Amino acid sequence: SMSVKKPKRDDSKDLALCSMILTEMETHEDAWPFLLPVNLKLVPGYKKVIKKPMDFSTIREKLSSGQYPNLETFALDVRLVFDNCETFNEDDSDIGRAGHNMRKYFEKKWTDTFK
């Protein structure tokens, strides 16, 4: 509360560390469904159904331009990518499986880097 603060957790490396994680997500072999925004002209249903599209290139630009106020807003967008994927794709599809694999990969890197 006012003039009462928990000890200051060092957040000075978060930007660099989120960038490293994002690099590792970008270079994963199953990243291909997530590298670029879904083409809303070419994919029926996407625009109406997925209220907040998100992809790794969009996260990378937001990261690089100071549009994440803290590491939690970064994780929210990464998770959004996978939550969108599960909303639109069957579990038993290449993309559906890719999304599960990437979410697992992300969550481990997140826990190991920060928790």
Swiss-Prot record:
Residues 9-113 form the Bromo domain. It is found in: Nucleus. Expressed at varying levels in several tissues, whereas a smaller transcript was expressed specifically in testis. Disulfide bonds: none annotated. It comes from the Eukaryota. Belongs to the WAL family. Component of the BRF-1 ISWI chromatin remodeling complex, at least composed of SMARCA1 and BAZ2B, which regulates the spacing of histone octamers on the DNA template to facilitate access to DNA. Within the BRF-1 ISWI chromatin remodeling complex interacts with SMARCA1; the interaction is direct. Component of the BRF-5 ISWI chromatin remodeling complex, at least composed of SMARCA5/SNF2H and BAZ2B, which regulates the spacing of histone octamers on the DNA template to facilitate access to DNA. Regulatory subunit of the ATP-dependent BRF-1 and BRF-5 ISWI chromatin remodeling complexes, which form ordered nucleosome arrays on chromatin and facilitate access to DNA during DNA-templated processes such as DNA replication, transcription, and repair. Both complexes regulate the spacing of nucleosomes along the chromatin and have the ability to slide mononucleosomes to the center of a DNA template. The BRF-1 ISWI chromatin remodeling complex has a lower ATP hydrolysis rate than the BRF-5 ISWI chromatin remodeling complex. This is Bromodomain adjacent to zinc finger domain protein 2B.
